[PDB]
Amino acid sequence: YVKFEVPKELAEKALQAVEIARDTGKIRKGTNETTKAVERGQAKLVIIAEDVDPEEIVAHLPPLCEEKEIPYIYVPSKKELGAAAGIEVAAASVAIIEPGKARDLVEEIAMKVRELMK
Template sequence: MRMKAYVKFEPSEELIKKTLKLVEMVAATQKAREEVVKKEGKKLEEKMLRRGTNEVTKAVDRGKAKLVVIAMDVEPEEVVMHLPPLCEEKGVPYTYVPSKLELGKASGIEVQAAAVAIIDAGEYSKMLDEIIKEVQKLKK
């Protein structure tokens, strides 16, 4: 498979697994928080995770995204092509995973997700920092 135009580097298998695991854990934590807040009759103030290209773009633009994860099998490529340059401009680290379906499932939805932004890693911030360091090494 040829590399897509928007894919700037090839992440290692270990980095991909770690990234998907982080997305999965943050999504599960967000869901648990939403259930607790819902029982109290309140609304969650800030989501920990944003799913979908439009939501991710807004999170990066507003300076809320800590890490952006982009699927490498997005068709047409133009859907996510703006994300790497936008992340570079805003100083937000980004990485890739092979599949939209995997990214969607890891983020807690039953459909595909072209991109996901982690807004708040909560108790997994150490893992987030490790992933960011690995990504920065790959981009050099």
């Protein structure tokens, strides 16, 4: 499901974006909530973590992100993001719905995937 390579520091900027968006606005976390967030177009950003077995459980979500034109990014460890998502469990995927104070920043980080193509 890993479509494009990402910097780990940029993944960190994304993670901090998920924290700030968690506190100041609405988000969803785990594949179910987050794919449902895409399908309903509420997803303003999709955060995937690459350490996932089975791969397939996340595999369906990234194409939909380009299919519904929702930005998507990778983060090194689902555990670290689950902690960033404010839960006690590793979370393979997360979505920012309401960016909150993170909004501008996420736009900027979104720009990176715009570049990440090809």
